[PDB]
């Protein structure tokens, strides 16, 4: 499978656009948090289907598939959040009916910290002009590189995706020196997605322990795990 066609399958594995079915209106602490949690739960369902459409993913032992998703789910959600917000500077497009601002994240203690992180990283990807195909590979890599017979299968898959990202960059038509610099800069931004991730989950866990948000079944499980 050539890099170009692997990237295609990733385009086909893309989950559908999700909405929380919420009528426009100001956000209170309760509505915002229940909205973010409800949205995450819906997306998690689509994330599982997405992963399975990644060539070779279902070939991995059930134990690996589970460990990979249980560890990277939040990062993948936020990577999707950042690609959706790329064209809307100063805003976080969690969903069509869930667009938030930095100041609106002030009604919830500790979340403003995170909105700022999500906005800075998003702003960074914006400057670099992240391309759709680059986004596809990066998100795939986030899932396949979260490993903290099946093992060889993983490395081979991660390698294929890495090989696909290098290809995408190569098509851009820029200098070789600039291809390496772009590859390094895109990959380094991952650490930033991962950090906003750990903070986002630490915050959610706290919210759960306080039964302040309805932690739906799939979301709770992923959280506890």
């Amino acid at each position: 499978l050539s890099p170009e066609q692997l990237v295609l399958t990733l385009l086909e594995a893309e989950p559908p656009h999700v909405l929380i079915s919420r009528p426009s209106a100001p956000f209170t602490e309760a509505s915002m948090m229940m909205s973010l949690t409800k949205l995450a739960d819906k997306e998690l369902v689509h994330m599982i289907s997405w992963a399975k459409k990644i060539p070779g993913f279902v070939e991995l032992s059930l134990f690996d598939q589970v460990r990979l998703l249980e560890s990277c789910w939040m990062e993948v959600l936020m990577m999707g959040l950042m690609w959706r917000s790329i064209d809307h500077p100063g805003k976080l497009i969690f969903a069509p009916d869930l667009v938030l601002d930095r100041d609106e994240g002030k009604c919830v203690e500790g979340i403003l910290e995170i909105f700022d992180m999500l906005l800075a990283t998003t702003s960074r990807f914006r400057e670099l002009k992240l391309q759709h195909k680059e986004y596809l590979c990066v998100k795939a890599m986030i899932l396949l590189n979260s490993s903290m017979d099946s093992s060889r299968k993983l490395a081979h898959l991660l390698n294929a995706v890495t090989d696909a990202l290098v290809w995408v960059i190569a098509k851009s038509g820029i200098s070789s020196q600039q291809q390496s610099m772009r590859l390094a800069n895109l990959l380094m931004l991952l650490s930033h997605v991962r950090h906003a991730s750990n903070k986002g989950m630490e915050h959610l866990l706290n919210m759960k322990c306080k039964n302040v948000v309805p932690v739906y079944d799939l979301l709770l499980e992923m959280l506890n795990a």
Partner: peptide, 10 residues
């Protein structure tokens, strides 16, 4: 076990 049932069904 929500994750596993979705990983084994379509």
């Amino acid at each position: 076990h929500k994750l596993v049932q979705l990983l084994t069904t379509t």
